[PDB]
Design a protein around this nucleic acid. Structure first.
Ligand SMILES: [Mg+2]
Ligand SMILES: [Mg+2]
Ligand SMILES: [Zn+2]
Ligand SMILES: [Zn+2]
Ligand SMILES: [Zn+2]
Ligand SMILES: [Zn+2]
Ligand SMILES: [Zn+2]
Ligand SMILES: [Zn+2]
Lengths: 104, 104
DNA sequence: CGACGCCCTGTCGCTGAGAAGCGTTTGCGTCG
DNA sequence: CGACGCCCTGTCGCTGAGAAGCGTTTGCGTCG
């Protein structure tokens, strides 16, 4: 099985530090293969704070989106998503427009 | 100080023997003050397998529910709860309907 | 943010805290 | 609902599964 565990983070567990770590420009990202996380949209594994899909039926990391990708491709802000207890990722909503999802 | 330590139990540590020891009928429970565990709902201390709340902010035994109580009062199966890495107890979800939690 | 002056002389953050289980305890309804 | 007889001898439900991220990767139009 190649699927990573999907751990839902409660909104109360979101801290002001990781809010400040939401990426505001894709060129400022820091890459780390060990401590980083992959945005589903741009497919870059970086250390900036990314979204957490809170649908229990979700799986893997398809719910992780960086700052620039979420706003530019879906008009949503990562800060709002992290504080929405009912937030679902675009793949869970069937609206993902990444190069793979819109191809199929 | 009067509160029993709450230890979050990883899903990978759940054994088939524990799943088999889930109570299917409250009349079949085995009481033991030393080796048993208390269900928050029915407040009986018995040896059957009970749920483990995985909310870090949880405490004590409020997250421990027996098989009959979880399905009859919440429509959930202890086996599913033990294998759910995001499972929170009804008191953590604020939906507990035991005689104490609905009293206030 | 923090000294500054004003009158009504003042207050929040963090940590770790926040029971458990024995006793009197088990659904519904007609009935003696 | 399930045997029962019929001819065309038969099929669905759950479970757990359903990637992730490095490499070749970043919008538009102009114009040399
Ligand atoms: Mg105490
Ligand atoms: Mg503690
Ligand atoms: Zn991205
Ligand atoms: Zn999702
Ligand atoms: Zn996609
Ligand atoms: Zn119980
Ligand atoms: Zn809990
Ligand atoms: Zn309760």
């Amino acid at each position: 099985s190649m699927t990573l565990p999907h751990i839902i983070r409660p909104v109360e567990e979101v801290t002001e530090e990781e809010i400040r770590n939401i990426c505001s420009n894709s060129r400022e990202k820091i890459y780390n293969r060990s401590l980083g996380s992959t945005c589903h949209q741009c497919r870059q594994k970086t250390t900036d704070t990314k979204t957490n899909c809170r649908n229990p039926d979700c799986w893997g990391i398809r719910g992780q989106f960086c700052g620039p990708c979420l706003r530019n491709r879906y008009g949503e802000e990562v800060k709002d998503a992290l504080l929405d207890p009912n937030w679902h990722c675009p793949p869970c909503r069937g609206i993902c427009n990444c190069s793979f999802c819109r191809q199929r």
